[PDB]
Amino acid sequence: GPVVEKIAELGKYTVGEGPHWDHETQTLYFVDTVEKTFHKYVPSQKKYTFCKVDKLVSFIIPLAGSPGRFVVSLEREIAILTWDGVSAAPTSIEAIVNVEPHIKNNRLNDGKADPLGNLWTGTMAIDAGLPIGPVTGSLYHLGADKKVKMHESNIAIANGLAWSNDLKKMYYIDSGKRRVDEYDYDASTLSISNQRPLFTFEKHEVPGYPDGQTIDEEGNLWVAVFQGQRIIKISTQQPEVLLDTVKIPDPQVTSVAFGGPNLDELYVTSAGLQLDDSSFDKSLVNGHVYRVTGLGVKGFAGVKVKL
Ligand SMILES: [Hg+2]
Ligand SMILES: [Hg+2]
Ligand SMILES: [Mg+2]
């Protein structure tokens, strides 16, 4: 079976999240969604750095055409951070847009660029809760003239995103729905329609909640299972098909990104935050970062945000 390696050099994260693999520099970026920190890991040189801000963060993606600059979330603001990748604070911050200026207790959560470079991201209540809590989030993309467009409402916990290689489908996760949805994606109008369930956890006895996801070159989705101690591989060719399961030692698996020189090493983030209604004792909940090899598939380089 696949080899799952704990990355000792990286330590433990409260809620490690938002992994992004920059292929040209062979570098993994990620966030902690509770500790207000950004992180960088260069595996070939065993280099780790972090960056501190005073707002909640949920994604970090290099800005297309601008080395040393990243598109990030700061609470409800999408911003450009100028960061040298090693100093413990940004050099400067340029706000782009506040997606929800008048929703004081919301935050941005998972975000990713579509294959054309458009940032998609969604919101949630800061005090969201599972299985039931306040449902206040929406799904957005950042379009022309730095204005966002809304694509879906009634989202409890805005989470993982992916797009099919032919640009005809988008895949999206609200963790509260315990399923992955598929949509028809119109790449020319950047709109989505015909929402329908692709994969429903209760139909397959999958525990926990879908969190982040990514897609491989064959079109399979790799989905992080928070409170499931696993990643799952699911079909996009047929609905409701579980292709494989890979156990990850940490129960609170949060997200996934393919990396390595050949894009065939799956990086997996997790959360050490100990929650009061957990299905796992505290001794099991650590928050390590993992690397999975031997899956027999390749992914895609992380896409930069175009502004
Ligand atoms: Hg930073
Ligand atoms: Hg940054
Ligand atoms: Mg997430």
mmCIF file of N, CA, C and O in Angstrom, residues 108-148:
data_model
loop_
_atom_site.group_PDB
_atom_site.id
_atom_site.type_symbol
_atom_site.label_atom_id
_atom_site.label_comp_id
_atom_site.label_asym_id
_atom_site.label_seq_id
_atom_site.Cartn_x
_atom_site.Cartn_y
_atom_site.Cartn_z
ATOM 1 N N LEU A 108 -13.372 34.377 5.841
ATOM 2 C CA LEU A 108 -13.046 33.523 4.704
ATOM 3 C C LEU A 108 -12.500 32.171 5.174
ATOM 4 O O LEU A 108 -11.880 32.059 6.235
ATOM 5 N N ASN A 109 -12.765 31.129 4.379
ATOM 6 C CA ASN A 109 -12.168 29.821 4.630
ATOM 7 C C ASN A 109 -11.467 29.332 3.362
ATOM 8 O O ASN A 109 -10.628 30.053 2.823
ATOM 9 N N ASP A 110 -11.764 28.132 2.864
ATOM 10 C CA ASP A 110 -10.877 27.575 1.846
ATOM 11 C C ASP A 110 -10.957 28.381 0.545
ATOM 12 O O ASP A 110 -11.983 28.991 0.223
ATOM 13 N N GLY A 111 -9.833 28.437 -0.162
ATOM 14 C CA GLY A 111 -9.740 29.188 -1.407
ATOM 15 C C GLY A 111 -8.700 28.553 -2.304
ATOM 16 O O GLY A 111 -7.742 27.932 -1.831
ATOM 17 N N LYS A 112 -8.894 28.709 -3.611
ATOM 18 C CA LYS A 112 -8.032 28.102 -4.617
ATOM 19 C C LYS A 112 -8.301 28.819 -5.937
ATOM 20 O O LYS A 112 -9.425 29.248 -6.194
ATOM 21 N N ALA A 113 -7.265 28.953 -6.765
ATOM 22 C CA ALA A 113 -7.459 29.453 -8.121
ATOM 23 C C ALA A 113 -7.949 28.333 -9.033
ATOM 24 O O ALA A 113 -7.443 27.208 -8.981
ATOM 25 N N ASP A 114 -8.928 28.656 -9.890
ATOM 26 C CA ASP A 114 -9.332 27.739 -10.938
ATOM 27 C C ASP A 114 -8.199 27.660 -11.965
ATOM 28 O O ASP A 114 -7.204 28.368 -11.851
ATOM 29 N N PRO A 115 -8.283 26.767 -12.957
ATOM 30 C CA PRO A 115 -7.134 26.593 -13.860
ATOM 31 C C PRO A 115 -6.824 27.827 -14.704
ATOM 32 O O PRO A 115 -5.728 27.903 -15.271
ATOM 33 N N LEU A 116 -7.731 28.794 -14.774
ATOM 34 C CA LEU A 116 -7.512 30.040 -15.495
ATOM 35 C C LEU A 116 -6.915 31.134 -14.623
ATOM 36 O O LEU A 116 -6.651 32.231 -15.129
ATOM 37 N N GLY A 117 -6.696 30.867 -13.332
ATOM 38 C CA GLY A 117 -6.125 31.855 -12.438
ATOM 39 C C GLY A 117 -7.119 32.683 -11.650
ATOM 40 O O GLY A 117 -6.697 33.613 -10.945
ATOM 41 N N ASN A 118 -8.417 32.390 -11.734
ATOM 42 C CA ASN A 118 -9.397 33.153 -10.970
ATOM 43 C C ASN A 118 -9.516 32.572 -9.570
ATOM 44 O O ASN A 118 -9.753 31.370 -9.411
ATOM 45 N N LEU A 119 -9.380 33.425 -8.558
ATOM 46 C CA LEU A 119 -9.529 32.968 -7.180
ATOM 47 C C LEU A 119 -10.991 32.695 -6.859
ATOM 48 O O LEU A 119 -11.839 33.581 -7.004
ATOM 49 N N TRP A 120 -11.275 31.482 -6.384
ATOM 50 C CA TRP A 120 -12.554 31.131 -5.781
ATOM 51 C C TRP A 120 -12.357 30.873 -4.294
ATOM 52 O O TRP A 120 -11.382 30.228 -3.895
ATOM 53 N N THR A 121 -13.286 31.368 -3.480
ATOM 54 C CA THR A 121 -13.199 31.172 -2.038
ATOM 55 C C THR A 121 -14.579 31.399 -1.434
ATOM 56 O O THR A 121 -15.433 32.059 -2.028
ATOM 57 N N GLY A 122 -14.784 30.847 -0.238
ATOM 58 C CA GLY A 122 -16.056 30.957 0.438
ATOM 59 C C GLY A 122 -15.880 31.359 1.892
ATOM 60 O O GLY A 122 -14.777 31.301 2.456
ATOM 61 N N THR A 123 -17.000 31.741 2.501
ATOM 62 C CA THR A 123 -17.026 32.218 3.874
ATOM 63 C C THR A 123 -17.794 31.270 4.787
ATOM 64 O O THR A 123 -18.397 30.272 4.360
ATOM 65 N N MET A 124 -17.739 31.602 6.077
ATOM 66 C CA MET A 124 -18.362 30.834 7.147
ATOM 67 C C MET A 124 -18.445 31.715 8.386
ATOM 68 O O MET A 124 -17.682 32.670 8.546
ATOM 69 N N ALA A 125 -19.358 31.358 9.282
ATOM 70 C CA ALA A 125 -19.342 31.951 10.611
ATOM 71 C C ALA A 125 -18.056 31.568 11.331
ATOM 72 O O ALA A 125 -17.599 30.428 11.237
ATOM 73 N N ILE A 126 -17.471 32.524 12.061
ATOM 74 C CA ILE A 126 -16.302 32.195 12.874
ATOM 75 C C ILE A 126 -16.666 31.143 13.912
ATOM 76 O O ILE A 126 -15.852 30.267 14.239
ATOM 77 N N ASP A 127 -17.895 31.188 14.417
ATOM 78 C CA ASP A 127 -18.402 30.208 15.377
ATOM 79 C C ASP A 127 -19.261 29.145 14.703
ATOM 80 O O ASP A 127 -20.256 28.681 15.271
ATOM 81 N N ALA A 128 -18.913 28.752 13.481
ATOM 82 C CA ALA A 128 -19.600 27.640 12.842
ATOM 83 C C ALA A 128 -19.379 26.362 13.641
ATOM 84 O O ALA A 128 -18.402 26.232 14.383
ATOM 85 N N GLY A 129 -20.294 25.416 13.491
ATOM 86 C CA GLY A 129 -20.233 24.192 14.272
ATOM 87 C C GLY A 129 -20.844 23.026 13.531
ATOM 88 O O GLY A 129 -21.764 23.191 12.728
ATOM 89 N N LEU A 130 -20.330 21.837 13.820
ATOM 90 C CA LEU A 130 -20.803 20.599 13.213
ATOM 91 C C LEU A 130 -21.252 19.625 14.297
ATOM 92 O O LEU A 130 -20.628 19.548 15.347
ATOM 93 N N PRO A 131 -22.313 18.847 14.031
ATOM 94 C CA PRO A 131 -23.062 18.777 12.772
ATOM 95 C C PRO A 131 -23.987 19.965 12.511
ATOM 96 O O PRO A 131 -24.357 20.177 11.353
ATOM 97 N N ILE A 132 -24.346 20.722 13.549
ATOM 98 C CA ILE A 132 -25.284 21.832 13.423
ATOM 99 C C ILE A 132 -24.706 23.075 14.093
ATOM 100 O O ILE A 132 -24.236 23.017 15.236
ATOM 101 N N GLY A 133 -24.754 24.199 13.374
ATOM 102 C CA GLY A 133 -24.308 25.485 13.856
ATOM 103 C C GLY A 133 -24.830 26.569 12.930
ATOM 104 O O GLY A 133 -25.635 26.296 12.033
ATOM 105 N N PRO A 134 -24.384 27.813 13.116
ATOM 106 C CA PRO A 134 -24.873 28.906 12.258
ATOM 107 C C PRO A 134 -24.385 28.743 10.823
ATOM 108 O O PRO A 134 -23.208 28.459 10.581
ATOM 109 N N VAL A 135 -25.306 28.907 9.873
ATOM 110 C CA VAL A 135 -25.028 28.746 8.448
ATOM 111 C C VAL A 135 -25.120 30.133 7.821
ATOM 112 O O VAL A 135 -26.215 30.628 7.540
ATOM 113 N N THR A 136 -23.965 30.761 7.582
ATOM 114 C CA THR A 136 -23.914 32.159 7.173
ATOM 115 C C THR A 136 -22.968 32.393 5.999
ATOM 116 O O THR A 136 -22.734 33.553 5.625
ATOM 117 N N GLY A 137 -22.418 31.328 5.410
ATOM 118 C CA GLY A 137 -21.393 31.485 4.397
ATOM 119 C C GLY A 137 -21.927 31.501 2.974
ATOM 120 O O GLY A 137 -23.067 31.114 2.705
ATOM 121 N N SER A 138 -21.063 31.951 2.064
ATOM 122 C CA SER A 138 -21.353 32.005 0.635
ATOM 123 C C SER A 138 -20.082 31.675 -0.136
ATOM 124 O O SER A 138 -18.971 31.783 0.388
ATOM 125 N N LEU A 139 -20.249 31.300 -1.404
ATOM 126 C CA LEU A 139 -19.136 30.996 -2.301
ATOM 127 C C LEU A 139 -18.961 32.131 -3.303
ATOM 128 O O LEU A 139 -19.940 32.568 -3.918
ATOM 129 N N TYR A 140 -17.715 32.583 -3.488
ATOM 130 C CA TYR A 140 -17.390 33.718 -4.346
ATOM 131 C C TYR A 140 -16.289 33.366 -5.331
ATOM 132 O O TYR A 140 -15.533 32.417 -5.126
ATOM 133 N N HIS A 141 -16.164 34.187 -6.384
ATOM 134 C CA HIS A 141 -14.893 34.291 -7.083
ATOM 135 C C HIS A 141 -14.535 35.757 -7.253
ATOM 136 O O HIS A 141 -15.401 36.639 -7.232
ATOM 137 N N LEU A 142 -13.241 36.007 -7.382
ATOM 138 C CA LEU A 142 -12.721 37.357 -7.543
ATOM 139 C C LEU A 142 -12.510 37.611 -9.027
ATOM 140 O O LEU A 142 -11.682 36.951 -9.663
ATOM 141 N N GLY A 143 -13.270 38.552 -9.570
ATOM 142 C CA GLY A 143 -13.279 38.759 -11.000
ATOM 143 C C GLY A 143 -12.622 40.052 -11.417
ATOM 144 O O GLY A 143 -11.636 40.483 -10.808
ATOM 145 N N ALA A 144 -13.176 40.664 -12.466
ATOM 146 C CA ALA A 144 -12.612 41.867 -13.056
ATOM 147 C C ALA A 144 -12.761 43.046 -12.110
ATOM 148 O O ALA A 144 -13.706 43.121 -11.321
ATOM 149 N N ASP A 145 -11.810 43.973 -12.190
ATOM 150 C CA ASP A 145 -11.850 45.198 -11.396
ATOM 151 C C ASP A 145 -11.971 44.890 -9.906
ATOM 152 O O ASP A 145 -12.525 45.680 -9.136
ATOM 153 N N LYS A 146 -11.470 43.719 -9.506
ATOM 154 C CA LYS A 146 -11.299 43.360 -8.099
ATOM 155 C C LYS A 146 -12.630 43.351 -7.348
ATOM 156 O O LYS A 146 -12.701 43.688 -6.165
ATOM 157 N N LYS A 147 -13.690 42.944 -8.042
ATOM 158 C CA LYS A 147 -15.014 42.773 -7.458
ATOM 159 C C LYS A 147 -15.339 41.287 -7.387
ATOM 160 O O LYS A 147 -15.014 40.529 -8.310
ATOM 161 N N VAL A 148 -15.973 40.864 -6.297
ATOM 162 C CA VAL A 148 -16.331 39.454 -6.216
ATOM 163 C C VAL A 148 -17.739 39.255 -6.752
ATOM 164 O O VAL A 148 -18.587 40.158 -6.770
#
